[PDB]
Amino acid sequence: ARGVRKHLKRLNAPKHWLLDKMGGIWAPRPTNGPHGLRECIPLILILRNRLHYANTYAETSMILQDKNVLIDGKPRTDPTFPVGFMDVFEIPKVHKTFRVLYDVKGRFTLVPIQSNEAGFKLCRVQKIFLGDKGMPYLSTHDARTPHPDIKTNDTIKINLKTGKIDEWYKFDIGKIVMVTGGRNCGRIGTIQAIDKHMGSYTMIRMKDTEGTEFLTRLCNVFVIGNDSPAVAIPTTKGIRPDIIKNRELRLRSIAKR
Amino acid sequence: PRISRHRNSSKTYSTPKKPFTKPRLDAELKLCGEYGLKCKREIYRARYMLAKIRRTARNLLTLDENDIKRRFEGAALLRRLHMLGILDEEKDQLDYVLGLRIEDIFKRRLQSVIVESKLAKSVHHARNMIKARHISVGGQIVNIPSYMVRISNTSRVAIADTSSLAPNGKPGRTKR
Amino acid sequence: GITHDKMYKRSKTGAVQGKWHKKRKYNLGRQPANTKLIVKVTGQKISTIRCRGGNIKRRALRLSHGSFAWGSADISHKARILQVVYNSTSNELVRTNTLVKGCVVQIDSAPFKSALSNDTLDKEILDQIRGDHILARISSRPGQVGTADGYILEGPELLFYQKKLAPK
Amino acid sequence: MQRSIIVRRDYLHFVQKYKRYERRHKHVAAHLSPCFRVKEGDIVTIGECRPLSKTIRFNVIKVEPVSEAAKKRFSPF
Amino acid sequence: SGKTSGLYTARKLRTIRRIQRWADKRYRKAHLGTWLKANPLEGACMARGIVTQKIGISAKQPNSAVRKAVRVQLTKNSKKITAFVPRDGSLTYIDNNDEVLVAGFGRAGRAVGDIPGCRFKVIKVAGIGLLALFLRKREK
Amino acid sequence: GIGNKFRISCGLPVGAVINCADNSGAKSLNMIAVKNWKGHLNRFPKASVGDMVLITVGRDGKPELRRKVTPAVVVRQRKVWRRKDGVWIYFQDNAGVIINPKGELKGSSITGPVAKEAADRWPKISTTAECVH
RNA sequence: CAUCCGGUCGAUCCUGCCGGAGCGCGACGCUCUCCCCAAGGACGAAGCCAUGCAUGCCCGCUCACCCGGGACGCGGCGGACGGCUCAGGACAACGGUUGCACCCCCCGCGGCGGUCCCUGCUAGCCGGACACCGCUGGCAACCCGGCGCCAAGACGUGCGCGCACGGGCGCGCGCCCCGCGGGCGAGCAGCGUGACGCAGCGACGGCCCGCCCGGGCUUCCGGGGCAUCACCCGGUCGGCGCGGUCGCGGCGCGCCGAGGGCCCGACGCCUGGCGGAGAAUCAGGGUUCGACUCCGGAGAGCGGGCCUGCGAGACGGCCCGCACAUCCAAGGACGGCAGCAGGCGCGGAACUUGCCCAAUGCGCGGCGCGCGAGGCAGCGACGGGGAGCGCGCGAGCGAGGCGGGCCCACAGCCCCCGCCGCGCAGCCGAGGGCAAGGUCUGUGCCAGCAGCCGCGGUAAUUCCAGCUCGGCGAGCGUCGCGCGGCGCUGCUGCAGUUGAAACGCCCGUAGUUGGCCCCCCGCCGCCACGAGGAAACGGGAGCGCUCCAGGCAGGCCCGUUGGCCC
């Protein structure tokens, strides 16, 4: 069909961005880069709509036209540059630091973190490639590209300062793990089991802290600390609040309103 | 293209399958006379919503008591009716919802709540007064006679702060 | 307008297929560049053709010479390249002297004559090395890669092939 | 065909307007190695392959014979 | 009759319905496509036309009257329609070969009432609806 | 026609069916007669290149043109003719182009080579013809 | 979300269909007091088009200019995205599900980064070679000529480390098989070893790698009618050797065989055939429709054929064949509104040659413009929703008008203010079905009415009028169609003695259906439970748009929400 599309309609946009159906024919489109289109959120919305800092979409481009915002410790200014999972985003004018995390419903959330938390970044290890003239290399969930005793699915704690391997979270049963994709995004649990089937789509079984054994695909699994979260968890601890527990919260919110 | 197409609309008024039934027709004239309704379309909107709410209770009936969906929907459906003041506050059961009649929807009318407050002492005068916006629901002047006041706002509904009774300025014949 | 699109082919049931589209650029095909053996060299013009994604391919159309390897002794050297002997698909292509992988060719023995001094290095290549021409087949796609390297025929392919062309 | 067999794939299709299943048959072309000796009425375990020919995208990975001809019986294996 | 009811008889049930669904005259008229090709008003609510002649039709007995009608040639299919001009004395409003819009009598291609052979009836003449002319809401 | 013509050997007599150069949708034109022909007794009317001929479109031709005597112009002839410059010229096939009584051509395009004599006589033929030989 | 009534007779009970009764969505007639919301030349013409507009943005060089204000050309990026419309296309498209160990992919993001030379070097870093612009000129126009001169982060050349290096090579694991990796479910990689090529990029380091965003294909299942279509196909079906392509493949070619399909409907034909997300109607099951919003396809009068590019077999590129045109000085030139307005043809049927990029995006580069994308207004009874035409004894507006406030790219409209204050209805009927005159006029089987049964033949409950009354309501009538009705299509759930209908009879192949019986597993089917795969949409939580149809808002806040299901 001719060439690559460079537009994303509002109805086409993923549900997680939560862009209002009316008021806009089309949502912004991410750029090819560290994260994927449905695996990332736009930087313009994070400031313009989520934080409400920019009154118009254009006046979000103005804010980063002059350097003022950083992703993963790098200026990374482009307005629609993809900002995805475990990203160290910091507004130095606001003097605030936010990991981009997944909410229990599944939408992305900016959660404030300590400078020590800003010091390290979490990214999953994709399959090791053997290219670049035989030098072993492995890619991340953020596409960044080694230590020999490492496998795929494990999470490396890249510093973003050293830009090198630090604490490697090996993929084994019982590590406290996050779910990146599927219906139960944001939920945190130790991996009870794995059934490979020696074909494809290895099954994933996850015992949560409360004893509910949630499940997902093995690709969509993120390690979050070999032992302990080793990150600033948003205050939900992936407890999976139920629809009625969500109605309680909403009704008390209205009471406070 | 044109998000005007994306905006939606719904049929809130249902005509009778049998159009001419003399007993039903006369009863509708009684309702129209007693509750000061403008046309039988007015009644149809109320009849439609009585039906759907009762149907929702019947859908909940085929669910087990305390089913996650049954409890969530059951709480909400009961809550809205007593929140508007339509259903008995204490009962809060599906069986009590099944007995609701359009008279309850008619009682929720702002123009209805005025004849009980003795402000216009006539549904037809209440309708007239609401048109001139001489009745205000708690700091909100209302030109529409079907405000559907929620139970708490019955205390709030009163003559408007704008010139009328205890006048801000000169109202009506005093003005003219 | 050459295409490899399957739309123009009939189905397994021998049924005509409705043409839902005009020929598309991605399914395009290009003229077979028939690499031609120069024969006596007393010219190697190799074309370069733009591909999909701005890639490049080298099209040999006339060439002589090219790298060859004696697998049995594992010695590899450039060779002059003599006439094509056998095409396995056509008897006309051999006489035309078009070059395509799988076409068996004669080669000069002068670069590889250095092994005549050595002894017991097989017997078949020993007699070809003594002779002016060595039996060898092409191992490179002359048209797509733009080079026509080959392996000197050794053992069974040489046995069957010699019987196929040389005796009368 | 030489170095090729036709695999009949029996299968059921459910109709919802009438809650009954209609029997269907799909023939599939499979390239067979000489290591497989194949007779009609036998049951073969095919596998996916890059298209070998116009109608062949499947290769045989195992062949299971049956005594004589075991009738047919529409077996969705 | 067993109405073929087996777990594997689902092609037979489907086949029987598609073949025997054509027996119904109404389904046949609707989905054969014969009406669409043969309809003077082919998939149209109404059509423009010239009045071939103004000729009354004698009504079917018991009723006895000359119901004034106009033969009409359609612009779209050049087919001749017999259209009954309605109400009282409305034929006078029409002149021979005037523009006329004609709509079906309301029986979906069937004749309505005593008029013999009247699949359609006149709605508008030279841009003016015949009732509008009849009530004098809009004059000729 | 423009100017004074020069006598050239008249290849086509009456009855000569000639192929149609124009795309008007006629394939073969049957020559009924020659415009401007006072003839002697027994002499079939004869026409050369650049001569207007009343023709009738044949059965193969589109029906609208068929059944009407129509004017045409001979544009090519098999018979060799001598130009006053001593060039003896001939064409592979005899051909005609259907033209109104005024000079305008019924067909938008003229197919194949066209003779100079026709091109000089008819300005429209000269502009339409790709090659004048 | 489970409902009927009127019509065969002297009456009766049936079958049987006719007609009503409700809804949707288009025409059509008559009328509409506002406010809000809103479809809009798809409907056998993907017919044809006048006019204006729909893709530019920057300087990389600036010698003109003239203070970096900076044109003009070259240079880079984009013009393939976006808008439009369903013509084609019936194992196709399209959808879920797969595979690329058979692959291509600019920007961007995260990394690697030895580039042989004989040499020839200027590598303190080089050439020649042109636009622009002068200077003379053609042409009716279009469009360009020659001269002379000068530029570029343009282009051409060019040192540069033998784990130099793009490519393509020849050779490098194995012992019945099955279990460690840089690996994988799997001999895949990446190299060592011996040659060849001298690819890039290098005159401001990118060679290259991955991720990714799309493609290119591919697996499996779904995927219209017709038997007054029963036999089909012949690169068709396999294998083999080449080419060709980004790549697999009869994808093209030779060669070699004899296949591949089919009553489980092939092939052939037809289609006023885009497909799904969805829509309409509705107890349940069904039925019906998929122009248009979202997605995927396919096309830009019709066929072909192409270069540029990272990507187009591009038509707001080019080239040609075929139509049908326009300019014209007659020599020549130059097309494409299935973009947006607007014209015309046609049809029953469908809007302004309207205004702006400020949002909503996108293009171009850190410093702002381009966009008939989109927004905004105009028309606008497609339709949806909210109020009016009274009420009071004399109470009182909003519909309006006029200035504000405010809104808005600016207007406006709404709303809020002060003043001034003009309430303002129709369209079908009354014999029944089916609601509402055992009133007076005319007329006299005429005129007419009447979906249906019926009325009218000089005392019409049926017409033409008056009068009354009814039903709906700023809407009401009329026609076409879908659905329900209609269990009158019957899976649920129809009938065949006599209302329509058991083949005259029998064998019979496919097809379909097959007594019981073994508990204990293996494959079936089957059933439950997961996992993963866009929303809008339907439902639904929460929420006072003054009420509502709405919208995902809102509020002194779950980490405020926008769950959750489909």
Tab-separated table of C-alpha atoms (C1' of nucleotides) in Angstrom, chain C residues 1-6 8-34 49-55 57-59 66-71 74-78 87-90 100-103 137 139-145 147 149-151 154, chain G residues 87-93 104-106 166-171 193-199 214-219 232-237 241-255 259-262 266-269 297-300 302-314:
chain	number	residue	atom	x	y	z
C	1	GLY	CA	6.090	-5.286	-17.052
C	2	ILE	CA	7.559	-8.682	-16.083
C	3	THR	CA	5.999	-9.942	-12.794
C	4	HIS	CA	6.161	-13.077	-10.571
C	5	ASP	CA	2.671	-12.272	-9.167
C	6	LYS	CA	0.547	-15.426	-8.652
C	8	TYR	CA	-1.836	-14.360	-13.396
C	9	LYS	CA	-1.603	-18.130	-12.657
C	10	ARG	CA	-4.690	-20.474	-12.642
C	11	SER	CA	-5.740	-22.344	-9.462
C	12	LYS	CA	-5.150	-26.016	-8.497
C	13	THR	CA	-8.631	-26.690	-9.982
C	14	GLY	CA	-7.554	-25.141	-13.319
C	15	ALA	CA	-9.765	-22.114	-12.678
C	16	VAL	CA	-9.301	-18.537	-13.991
C	17	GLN	CA	-8.627	-16.015	-11.172
C	18	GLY	CA	-10.213	-12.527	-11.193
C	19	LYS	CA	-7.571	-9.818	-11.565
C	20	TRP	CA	-8.116	-7.682	-8.458
C	21	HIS	CA	-5.116	-5.370	-9.036
C	22	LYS	CA	-2.816	-3.929	-11.768
C	23	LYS	CA	0.808	-5.277	-11.725
C	24	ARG	CA	2.588	-3.966	-8.594
C	25	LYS	CA	6.232	-2.860	-8.277
C	26	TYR	CA	7.067	-5.244	-5.416
C	27	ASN	CA	6.238	-8.380	-7.479
C	28	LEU	CA	8.318	-7.052	-10.458
C	29	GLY	CA	10.785	-9.190	-12.450
C	30	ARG	CA	13.717	-7.952	-14.597
C	31	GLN	CA	15.213	-9.166	-17.911
C	32	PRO	CA	17.452	-12.272	-17.431
C	33	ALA	CA	20.959	-10.822	-17.834
C	34	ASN	CA	22.562	-13.785	-19.595
C	49	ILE	CA	21.049	-2.739	-10.813
C	50	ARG	CA	19.064	-0.711	-8.231
C	51	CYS	CA	16.872	-3.060	-6.115
C	52	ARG	CA	14.062	-2.675	-3.510
C	53	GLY	CA	14.962	-0.448	-0.524
C	54	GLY	CA	17.811	1.200	-2.487
C	55	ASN	CA	19.897	-2.019	-2.338
C	57	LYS	CA	22.818	-6.289	-7.254
C	58	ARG	CA	25.670	-6.925	-9.740
C	59	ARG	CA	24.516	-8.294	-13.141
C	66	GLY	CA	37.260	-15.851	-12.009
C	67	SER	CA	38.218	-17.554	-8.729
C	68	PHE	CA	38.200	-21.396	-8.688
C	69	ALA	CA	39.007	-23.945	-5.968
C	70	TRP	CA	40.533	-27.475	-6.045
C	71	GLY	CA	38.534	-28.937	-3.106
C	74	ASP	CA	41.916	-27.299	-0.759
C	75	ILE	CA	44.055	-24.862	-2.846
C	76	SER	CA	42.148	-21.853	-4.320
C	77	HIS	CA	43.374	-19.714	-7.287
C	78	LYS	CA	41.995	-17.401	-10.017
C	87	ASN	CA	24.315	-27.013	-19.323
C	88	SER	CA	22.171	-29.869	-17.832
C	89	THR	CA	19.033	-27.987	-18.988
C	90	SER	CA	19.783	-27.166	-22.676
C	100	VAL	CA	24.810	-19.843	-15.200
C	101	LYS	CA	25.505	-21.728	-11.913
C	102	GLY	CA	25.396	-25.502	-12.555
C	103	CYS	CA	26.833	-25.067	-16.080
C	137	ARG	CA	31.377	-26.550	-12.549
C	139	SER	CA	29.142	-22.457	-7.949
C	140	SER	CA	28.230	-18.731	-8.162
C	141	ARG	CA	25.070	-17.024	-9.498
C	142	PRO	CA	26.769	-15.025	-12.322
C	143	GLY	CA	23.669	-12.900	-12.956
C	144	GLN	CA	22.632	-12.012	-9.386
C	145	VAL	CA	25.982	-11.801	-7.537
C	147	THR	CA	30.829	-13.010	-10.092
C	149	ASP	CA	33.374	-18.476	-9.091
C	150	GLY	CA	33.318	-22.273	-9.286
C	151	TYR	CA	34.733	-25.526	-7.894
C	154	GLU	CA	36.276	-33.750	-8.200
G	87	A	C1'	-15.762	0.477	-10.125
G	88	G	C1'	-13.414	-4.030	-10.133
G	89	G	C1'	-12.548	-8.600	-7.289
G	90	A	C1'	-16.678	-14.962	-5.433
G	91	C	C1'	-11.249	-20.831	-2.823
G	92	A	C1'	-10.049	-13.796	-4.265
G	93	A	C1'	-10.647	-9.632	-1.170
G	104	C	C1'	12.670	-5.949	2.487
G	105	C	C1'	12.109	-1.502	5.763
G	106	C	C1'	13.705	5.987	5.384
G	166	G	C1'	30.349	-5.160	1.255
G	167	G	C1'	29.189	-9.191	-1.816
G	168	G	C1'	29.537	-13.932	-3.762
G	169	C	C1'	32.631	-18.046	-3.018
G	170	G	C1'	35.702	-23.504	-2.157
G	171	C	C1'	36.733	-25.948	2.691
G	193	U	C1'	41.023	-21.881	6.473
G	194	G	C1'	42.378	-21.173	1.360
G	195	A	C1'	41.115	-17.694	-2.665
G	196	C	C1'	38.528	-13.307	-5.411
G	197	G	C1'	36.382	-8.386	-5.527
G	198	C	C1'	38.224	-3.560	-4.342
G	199	A	C1'	31.868	-2.484	-2.596
G	214	G	C1'	5.156	-0.569	8.473
G	215	G	C1'	5.053	-3.614	4.325
G	216	G	C1'	6.039	-8.539	0.941
G	217	C	C1'	4.027	-12.794	1.356
G	218	U	C1'	2.395	-17.096	4.093
G	219	U	C1'	-0.549	-21.164	7.543
G	232	C	C1'	-13.462	-29.770	-15.355
G	233	C	C1'	-7.923	-27.818	-16.130
G	234	G	C1'	-3.807	-28.323	-19.559
G	235	G	C1'	1.676	-24.379	-16.522
G	236	U	C1'	-3.069	-27.162	-15.507
G	237	C	C1'	-0.615	-31.267	-11.411
G	241	G	C1'	17.945	-28.066	-13.678
G	242	C	C1'	18.475	-22.862	-14.015
G	243	G	C1'	17.120	-17.925	-14.135
G	244	G	C1'	14.390	-13.951	-11.935
G	245	U	C1'	12.925	-11.384	-7.378
G	246	C	C1'	13.600	-8.174	-1.324
G	247	G	C1'	12.522	-13.251	-1.066
G	248	C	C1'	9.641	-18.649	-1.201
G	249	G	C1'	7.115	-20.568	-5.112
G	250	G	C1'	5.301	-22.775	-12.336
G	251	C	C1'	7.031	-17.031	-10.615
G	252	G	C1'	9.351	-17.382	-16.208
G	253	C	C1'	12.169	-21.079	-18.873
G	254	G	C1'	13.994	-25.821	-20.686
G	255	C	C1'	13.615	-30.993	-19.216
G	259	G	C1'	-1.343	-35.746	-12.743
G	260	G	C1'	-4.614	-31.990	-10.005
G	261	G	C1'	-9.959	-31.201	-9.180
G	262	C	C1'	-15.307	-33.071	-8.323
G	266	A	C1'	-16.069	-29.287	-8.785
G	267	C	C1'	-15.785	-26.511	-13.326
G	268	G	C1'	-18.743	-23.128	-15.917
G	269	C	C1'	-22.013	-18.928	-15.585
G	297	G	C1'	-8.595	-4.066	0.346
G	298	A	C1'	-8.949	-1.731	-4.799
G	299	G	C1'	-8.998	2.249	-8.226
G	300	A	C1'	-8.034	7.175	-9.761
G	302	C	C1'	-9.940	3.214	-20.242
G	303	G	C1'	-5.925	-0.315	-21.145
G	304	G	C1'	-0.690	-0.843	-20.735
G	305	G	C1'	4.519	0.657	-19.745
G	306	C	C1'	7.925	3.456	-16.665
G	307	C	C1'	11.727	6.467	-13.959
G	308	U	C1'	12.541	9.031	-9.271
G	309	G	C1'	12.793	7.314	-4.571
G	310	C	C1'	13.709	4.190	1.652
G	311	G	C1'	9.186	2.948	-0.241
G	312	A	C1'	4.543	4.379	-5.949
G	313	G	C1'	4.021	-0.227	-11.387
G	314	A	C1'	2.156	7.064	-8.309
